[PDB]
Enzyme design. Structure first.
Site, PDB file in Angstrom:
ATOM      1  N   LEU A   9       0.809  -1.213   0.000  1.00 55.44           N
ATOM      2  CA  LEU A   9       0.000   0.000   0.000  1.00 55.44           C
ATOM      3  C   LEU A   9       0.846   1.268   0.000  1.00 55.44           C
ATOM      4  O   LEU A   9       0.564   2.204  -0.754  1.00 55.44           O
ATOM      5  CB  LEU A   9      -0.942   0.002   1.206  1.00 55.44           C
ATOM      6  CG  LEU A   9      -2.231  -0.799   1.048  1.00 55.44           C
ATOM      7  CD1 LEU A   9      -3.172  -0.511   2.206  1.00 55.44           C
ATOM      8  CD2 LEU A   9      -2.898  -0.497  -0.284  1.00 55.44           C
ATOM      9  N   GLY A  12       4.946   5.370   5.532  1.00 47.47           N
ATOM     10  CA  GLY A  12       4.856   6.635   6.231  1.00 47.47           C
ATOM     11  C   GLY A  12       6.198   7.007   6.828  1.00 47.47           C
ATOM     12  O   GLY A  12       7.242   6.631   6.289  1.00 47.47           O
ATOM     13  N   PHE A  14       6.844   6.134  10.030  1.00 47.70           N
ATOM     14  CA  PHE A  14       7.053   5.184  11.118  1.00 47.70           C
ATOM     15  C   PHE A  14       6.845   3.727  10.735  1.00 47.70           C
ATOM     16  O   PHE A  14       7.281   2.854  11.493  1.00 47.70           O
ATOM     17  CB  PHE A  14       6.132   5.513  12.299  1.00 47.70           C
ATOM     18  CG  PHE A  14       6.675   6.566  13.217  1.00 47.70           C
ATOM     19  CD1 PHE A  14       7.566   6.233  14.223  1.00 47.70           C
ATOM     20  CD2 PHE A  14       6.297   7.889  13.075  1.00 47.70           C
ATOM     21  CE1 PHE A  14       8.070   7.200  15.068  1.00 47.70           C
ATOM     22  CE2 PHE A  14       6.796   8.862  13.919  1.00 47.70           C
ATOM     23  CZ  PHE A  14       7.684   8.518  14.915  1.00 47.70           C
ATOM     24  N   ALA A  15       6.217   3.419   9.603  1.00 50.72           N
ATOM     25  CA  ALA A  15       5.837   2.044   9.309  1.00 50.72           C
ATOM     26  C   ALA A  15       5.530   1.906   7.824  1.00 50.72           C
ATOM     27  O   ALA A  15       5.408   2.895   7.097  1.00 50.72           O
ATOM     28  CB  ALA A  15       4.637   1.618  10.156  1.00 50.72           C
ATOM     29  N   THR A  16       5.398   0.654   7.386  1.00 52.01           N
ATOM     30  CA  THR A  16       5.050   0.314   6.011  1.00 52.01           C
ATOM     31  C   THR A  16       3.711  -0.412   5.992  1.00 52.01           C
ATOM     32  O   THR A  16       3.472  -1.305   6.807  1.00 52.01           O
ATOM     33  CB  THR A  16       6.130  -0.564   5.369  1.00 52.01           C
ATOM     34  OG1 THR A  16       6.245  -1.793   6.098  1.00 52.01           O
ATOM     35  CG2 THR A  16       7.470   0.144   5.386  1.00 52.01           C
ATOM     36  N   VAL A  17       2.837  -0.032   5.062  1.00 50.87           N
ATOM     37  CA  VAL A  17       1.455  -0.503   5.038  1.00 50.87           C
ATOM     38  C   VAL A  17       1.232  -1.375   3.810  1.00 50.87           C
ATOM     39  O   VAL A  17       1.717  -1.063   2.717  1.00 50.87           O
ATOM     40  CB  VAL A  17       0.464   0.676   5.063  1.00 50.87           C
ATOM     41  CG1 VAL A  17      -0.960   0.175   5.254  1.00 50.87           C
ATOM     42  CG2 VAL A  17       0.841   1.654   6.160  1.00 50.87           C
ATOM     43  N   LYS A  26      -0.074  -2.390   9.084  1.00 47.68           N
ATOM     44  CA  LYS A  26       0.939  -1.368   9.297  1.00 47.68           C
ATOM     45  C   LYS A  26       2.057  -1.975  10.136  1.00 47.68           C
ATOM     46  O   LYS A  26       1.823  -2.392  11.275  1.00 47.68           O
ATOM     47  CB  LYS A  26       0.323  -0.156   9.995  1.00 47.68           C
ATOM     48  CG  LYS A  26       1.207   1.062  10.070  1.00 47.68           C
ATOM     49  CD  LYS A  26       0.607   2.125  10.978  1.00 47.68           C
ATOM     50  CE  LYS A  26      -0.742   2.601  10.461  1.00 47.68           C
ATOM     51  NZ  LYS A  26      -1.209   3.822  11.174  1.00 47.68           N
ATOM     52  N   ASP A 113      -2.578  15.328  14.406  1.00 46.59           N
ATOM     53  CA  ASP A 113      -1.954  15.118  13.105  1.00 46.59           C
ATOM     54  C   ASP A 113      -2.973  15.212  11.979  1.00 46.59           C
ATOM     55  O   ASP A 113      -2.864  14.501  10.976  1.00 46.59           O
ATOM     56  CB  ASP A 113      -1.221  13.774  13.043  1.00 46.59           C
ATOM     57  CG  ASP A 113      -0.130  13.755  11.981  1.00 46.59           C
ATOM     58  OD1 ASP A 113       0.320  14.847  11.572  1.00 46.59           O
ATOM     59  OD2 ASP A 113       0.273  12.653  11.554  1.00 46.59           O
TER      60      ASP A 113
HETATM   61  C1  LIG Z   1      -7.346   2.309 -11.812  1.00 51.54           C
HETATM   62  C2  LIG Z   1      -8.355   2.035 -10.690  1.00 51.54           C
HETATM   63  C3  LIG Z   1      -7.957   2.698  -9.361  1.00 51.54           C
HETATM   64  O1  LIG Z   1      -8.192   3.842  -9.182  1.00 51.54           O
HETATM   65  N1  LIG Z   1      -7.297   1.873  -8.348  1.00 51.54           N
HETATM   66  C4  LIG Z   1      -6.843   2.334  -7.027  1.00 51.54           C
HETATM   67  C5  LIG Z   1      -6.525   3.664  -6.772  1.00 51.54           C
HETATM   68  C6  LIG Z   1      -6.091   4.055  -5.506  1.00 51.54           C
HETATM   69  C7  LIG Z   1      -5.969   3.103  -4.501  1.00 51.54           C
HETATM   70  C8  LIG Z   1      -5.479   3.477  -3.087  1.00 51.54           C
HETATM   71  O2  LIG Z   1      -5.520   4.591  -2.685  1.00 51.54           O
HETATM   72  N2  LIG Z   1      -4.952   2.397  -2.258  1.00 51.54           N
HETATM   73  C9  LIG Z   1      -4.458   2.645  -0.904  1.00 51.54           C
HETATM   74  C10 LIG Z   1      -3.161   3.093  -0.704  1.00 51.54           C
HETATM   75  C11 LIG Z   1      -2.705   3.316   0.590  1.00 51.54           C
HETATM   76  C12 LIG Z   1      -3.549   3.087   1.669  1.00 51.54           C
HETATM   77  C13 LIG Z   1      -4.847   2.635   1.469  1.00 51.54           C
HETATM   78  N3  LIG Z   1      -5.787   2.375   2.562  1.00 51.54           N
HETATM   79  C14 LIG Z   1      -5.469   2.362   3.991  1.00 51.54           C
HETATM   80  N4  LIG Z   1      -6.248   1.659   4.785  1.00 51.54           N
HETATM   81  C15 LIG Z   1      -6.037   1.601   6.087  1.00 51.54           C
HETATM   82  C16 LIG Z   1      -4.968   2.305   6.623  1.00 51.54           C
HETATM   83 CL1  LIG Z   1      -4.683   2.225   8.382  1.00 51.54          CL
HETATM   84  C17 LIG Z   1      -4.159   3.051   5.770  1.00 51.54           C
HETATM   85  C18 LIG Z   1      -2.955   3.869   6.250  1.00 51.54           C
HETATM   86  C19 LIG Z   1      -2.818   4.532   7.460  1.00 51.54           C
HETATM   87  N5  LIG Z   1      -1.627   5.127   7.469  1.00 51.54           N
HETATM   88  C20 LIG Z   1      -0.982   4.880   6.292  1.00 51.54           C
HETATM   89  C21 LIG Z   1       0.295   5.292   5.826  1.00 51.54           C
HETATM   90  C22 LIG Z   1       0.733   4.902   4.567  1.00 51.54           C
HETATM   91  C23 LIG Z   1      -0.082   4.109   3.760  1.00 51.54           C
HETATM   92  C24 LIG Z   1      -1.334   3.707   4.218  1.00 51.54           C
HETATM   93  C25 LIG Z   1      -1.779   4.102   5.502  1.00 51.54           C
HETATM   94  N6  LIG Z   1      -4.454   3.045   4.480  1.00 51.54           N
HETATM   95  C26 LIG Z   1      -5.297   2.415   0.173  1.00 51.54           C
HETATM   96  C27 LIG Z   1      -6.274   1.775  -4.756  1.00 51.54           C
HETATM   97  C28 LIG Z   1      -6.708   1.390  -6.019  1.00 51.54           C
HETATM   98  C29 LIG Z   1      -5.887   2.286 -11.334  1.00 51.54           C
HETATM   99  N7  LIG Z   1      -5.004   1.512 -12.202  1.00 51.54           N
HETATM  100  C30 LIG Z   1      -4.292   2.393 -13.111  1.00 51.54           C
HETATM  101  C31 LIG Z   1      -5.718   0.489 -12.950  1.00 51.54           C
END
Ligand SMILES: *[C@H](CC(=O)Nc1ccc(C(=O)Nc2cccc(Nc3ncc(Cl)c(-c4c[nH]c5ccccc45)n3)c2)cc1)CN(C)C
Lengths: 288, 65, 279
Positions: A9, A12, A14-17, A26, A113
Site C-alpha cells: 500500500l 509513512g 514510522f511504518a510500512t502498510v 501497518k 496530526d
Molecule cells: C485504476 C483504478 C484505481 O483507481 N485503483 C486504485 C486507486 C487508488 C488506490 C489506493 O488509494 N490504495 C491505498 C493506498 C494506501 C492506503 C490505502 N488504505 C489504507 N487503509 C487503512 C490504513 Cl490504516 C491506511 C494507512 C494509514 N496510514 C498509512 C500510511 C501509509 C499508507 C497507508 C496508511 N491506508 C489504500 C487503490 C486502487 C488504477 N489503475 C491504473 C488500474
C-alpha cells in the site's frame, strides 16, 4: 499469520502498510511507542468516522497493526484534478471529519496530526480519522505536551508559538486548513519553516492584536511580527457563501479558546443550510 | 436531504455532569487551580480539567457488571 | 472514558468466584501442559495468590523508589496489568519477578511516562550485567504481556475520580465544611482497596466514592445526604441501595484481606524457584 499479503500500500514516517485479506497491515527500547499509542487509543474508541483497529501481531519487539482497508484518502481526492468538489461534497467531508472529531474530543483525545492524507475514505464514502500515532489525551494539567505536533502546513499558531498546554483548537485549526485545501485544491499555508509558517498565516489572515488573542505574548516562543492587514476571507474564498465564511472565520480565530469547537462547528448554519451533504455513496471516487 | 445536529448520546451510567460553560457560574472553578496566562494563550483553561475530573468521578458510578 | 472502556467491557468481573474460576483454570492448564510435556512441585491456586500478592507489593516498592518519580497513574496501570496477567496465567510458567517489571515498563510506555530503558533498569538493585539480563527478559516478555492483556492497555484508575469527587464535594456539599481533611485517610483506604481484587470487580468511580465515604465514616461525618440529594439518588431508591451495597461489599473485601506471611512467602518462593529451574 492469519493474513496473506496481497499488495503493497505505501509507507509513512514510522511504518510500512500493505493490503491483505480486506484489511491493511501497518508494520533496546522495546515495542515502538507509536504503535502502542495507536493500539491503546483505538481500542477505547468506537465511532463510524474513526478508523477501526481489528488486530495486532508481532514477535519480540516488532509489532504489526491491522485496520480496515480504506480505499483512499482526502489528499488523493484534493490532488485529483479530474475530480470536481461541489459544495455538497465539501460539506459531507467536513461533516464526517467534525463528527469524528466531536466523538474524539468528547473522550478527551486530540488527534494532533489532522491533514488530508490522514482522513481516509472507503468505497462507501465514509470518512475516518486515521494515524493516531501522534494522538494524545488532554485535559490533564500535569501532562506536558510538546509543540512539534501537527504537520507544519496545518499547525495552529499557538503551537508555532511554542504552546505546551493546548486544547481542541490544535485540531480545529487543522480542520480549517483542510477546509481551505478543499476549497482551493492546494495547501492553504505552505510554509517551509516555523517562521515562514507564522509569516504565511499572518500575511493571509492578518497579524493578531491583543484583542484577538489576549495572552499571545506570554507564549514561550512568541516573536513580534510586522502588522499585516490580512486578506478578507471572501477575497481568499471567492466562491464561499456567508455561512461557509462564518465557519471558516470560526475555525481560523487566533484565540484558541474563541476558536469554535467541533460541536459548535457542527451546530453552525452552514451544515444545516441547503444544499445538504452528499450521501457517502455519491461522493467522488479517484479512478486511477 | 438536509443535516440536523443531534448531540452524542453516550450512556455514562452515572450522575449528570454540569456543562463546561456552566462550571464557572456554578462555583466549581473555585476548587481547581487557575490556568496561567500561557495556558490560556494555548487554549487550556481550568474548566477543561474540572470538567474531565467531574466526568471521571461520575462515569459508571451506577454500573454493575 | 470508563463507561465505554475496554476495562468496563472486559476486565470488570461479576464476582470473586469468577476470578477464582479463571485463576484455577490457569493453574490447572499449566499443570496439564507440564504433565503432557514431562508431584508436590506444583503450586496450589491459593499459593499462587499468596505469591501474586507478595510480588504486587514488590512492584509497589519498585515504583515508589523509581527515579525519575513515577506518576501514580503509571503505578496503578502497572498493578492492574499485573492482576490481569495473573488472572489467566500461572506464576509457575511466567515468573512474577520479570512479569511485574514488564508491567511497570509497559505501563510507563502506555501512560506516556517517557523513560529510557537504561534508566528504567538502573532502578533495579542489581549489577550492570544483572540489569542488562533483566532488560533482555523484559523486552522478551513485553509482547507476551500485551497479548495476555488482549491489547487492552488503557487503565482507568480511581485517582482522577477521587479528585472529581473532591471538587464536587467542595462545590455542592457545604455541610462538609472542608472535604480536604478526608483526603489522607481516604487515600490510605484507596491503597488498601488496591491490595484486593476490587479493581477487577468495581468501577473506578465506585472505588473512589467508597474510599471517600469510608474516610468520612472514620471521622464521624455522615454524607448520606450527598448520595441522596446531590447525586440525585433520592429520585431512584433502587440505585441508592445498589450503590450502598456495592460500597459495603468493597469494604468487606478490604476487611477480609490477609497480607502474605513471611514464612509462607519464603516456602512458596522456594517452590516457585524449583518450578522455574525445571522444565
Ligand atoms: C485504476 C483504478 C484505481 O483507481 N485503483 C486504485 C486507486 C487508488 C488506490 C489506493 O488509494 N490504495 C491505498 C493506498 C494506501 C492506503 C490505502 N488504505 C489504507 N487503509 C487503512 C490504513 Cl490504516 C491506511 C494507512 C494509514 N496510514 C498509512 C500510511 C501509509 C499508507 C497507508 C496508511 N491506508 C489504500 C487503490 C486502487 C488504477 N489503475 C491504473 C488500474
Amino acid at each position: 499469520k492469519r493474513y496473506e499479503k496481497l499488495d503493497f500500500l505505501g509507507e509513512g514516517q514510522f511504518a510500512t502498510v500493505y493490503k491483505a485479506r480486506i484489511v491493511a497491515i501497518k508494520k533496546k527500547d522495546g515495542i515502538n511507542r507509536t504503535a502502542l499509542r495507536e493500539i491503546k487509543l483505538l481500542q477505547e474508541l468506537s465511532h463510524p468516522n474513526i478508523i477501526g483497529l481489528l488486530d495486532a501481531f508481532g514477535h519480540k519487539s516488532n509489532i504489526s497493526l491491522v485496520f480496515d482497508f480504506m480505499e483512499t484518502d482526502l489528499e488523493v481526492i484534493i490532488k485529483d484534478n479530474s475530480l470536481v468538489l461541489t459544495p455538497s461534497h465539501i460539506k459531507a467531508y467536513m461533516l464526517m471529519t467534525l463528527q469524528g472529531l466531536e466523538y474524539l474530543h468528547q473522550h478527551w483525545i486530540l488527534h494532533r496530526d489532522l491533514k488530508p492524507n490522514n482522513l481516509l475514505l472507503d468505497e462507501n464514502g465514509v470518512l475516518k480519522l486515521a494515524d493516531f500515532g501522534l494522538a494524545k489525551s488532554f485535559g490533564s494539567p500535569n501532562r506536558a505536551y510538546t509543540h512539534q505536533v501537527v504537520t507544519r502546513w496545518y499547525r495552529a499558531p499557538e503551537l508555532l508559538f511554542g504552546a505546551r498546554m493546548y486544547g481542541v483548537g490544535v485540531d480545529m485549526w487543522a480542520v480549517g486548513c483542510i477546509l481551505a485545501e478543499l476549497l482551493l485544491r492546494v495547501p492553504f499555508l505552505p510554509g517551509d519553516s516555523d517562521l515562514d509558517q507564522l509569516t504565511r498565516i499572518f500575511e493571509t489572515l492578518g497579524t493578531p492584536t491583543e484583542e484577538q488573542w489576549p495572552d499571545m505574548c506570554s507564549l514561550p516562543d512568541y516573536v513580534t511580527f510586522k502588522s499585516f492587514p490580512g486578506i478578507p476571507l471572501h477575497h481568499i474564498f471567492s466562491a464561499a457563501g456567508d455561512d461557509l465564511l462564518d465557519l471558516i472565520q470560526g475555525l481560523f480565530l487566533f484565540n484558541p479558546c474563541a476558536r469554535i469547537t467541533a460541536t459548535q462547528a457542527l451546530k453552525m448554519k452552514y451544515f444545516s443550510n441547503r444544499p445538504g451533504p452528499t450521501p457517502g455513496c455519491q461522493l467522488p471516487r479517484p479512478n486511477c | 436531504a438536509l443535516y440536523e445536529y443531534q448531540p452524542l448520546q453516550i450512556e455514562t451510567y452515572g450522575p449528570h455532569v454540569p456543562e463546561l460553560e456552566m462550571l464557572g457560574r456554578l462555583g466549581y472553578l473555585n476548587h481547581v487551580r487557575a490556568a496561567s496566562p500561557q495556558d490560556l494563550a494555548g487554549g487550556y483553561t481550568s474548566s477543561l480539567a474540572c470538567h474531565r475530573a467531574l466526568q471521571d468521578a461520575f462515569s459508571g458510578l451506577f454500573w454493575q457488571p | 472514558m470508563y463507561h465505554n472502556s475496554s476495562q468496563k467491557r472486559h476486565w470488570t468481573f461479576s464476582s470473586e468466584e469468577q476470578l477464582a474460576r479463571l485463576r484455577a483454570d490457569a493453574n490447572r492448564k499449566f499443570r496439564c501442559k507440564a504433565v503432557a510435556n514431562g508431584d508436590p512441585v506444583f503450586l496450589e491456586p491459593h499459593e499462587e495468590m499468596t505469591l501474586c500478592k507478595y510480588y504486587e507489593k514488590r512492584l509497589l516498592e519498585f515504583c515508589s523508589v523509581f527515579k525519575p518519580a513515577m506518576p501514580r497513574s503509571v503505578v496503578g496501570t502497572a498493578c492492574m496489568y499485573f492482576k490481569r496477567f495473573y488472572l489467566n496465567n500461572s506464576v509457575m510458567e511466567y515468573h512474577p519477578r520479570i512479569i511485574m517489571l514488564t508491567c511497570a515498563f509497559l505501563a510507563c510506555k502506555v501512560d506516556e511516562f517517557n523513560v529510557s530503558s537504561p534508566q528504567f533498569v538502573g532502578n533495579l538493585r542489581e549489577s550492570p550485567l544483572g540489569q542488562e539480563k533483566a532488560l533482555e527478559q523484559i523486552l522478551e516478555y513485553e509482547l507476551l504481556l500485551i497479548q495476555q492483556l488482549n491489547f487492552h492497555l488503557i487503565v482507568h484508575n480511581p485517582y482522577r475520580p477521587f479528585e472529581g469527587f473532591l471538587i464536587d464535594l467542595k462545590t455542592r456539599y457545604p455541610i462538609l465544611e472542608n472535604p480536604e481533611i478526608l483526603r489522607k485517610t481516604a487515600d490510605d483506604f484507596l491503597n488498601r482497596i488496591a491490595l484486593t481484587d476490587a479493581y477487577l470487580l468495581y468501577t473506578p468511580s465506585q472505588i473512589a466514592l467508597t474510599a471517600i465515604l469510608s474516610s468520612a465514616s472514620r471521622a464521624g461525618i455522615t454524607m448520606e445526604s450527598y448520595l441522596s440529594e446531590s447525586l440525585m439518588l433520592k429520585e431512584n431508591r433502587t440505585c441508592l441501595s445498589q450503590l450502598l451495597d456495592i460500597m459495603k461489599s468493597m469494604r468487606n473485601l478490604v476487611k477480609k484481606y490477609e497480607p502474605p506471611r513471611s514464612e509462607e512467602v519464603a516456602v512458596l518462593k522456594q517452590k516457585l524457584e524449583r518450578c522455574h529451574s525445571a522444565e
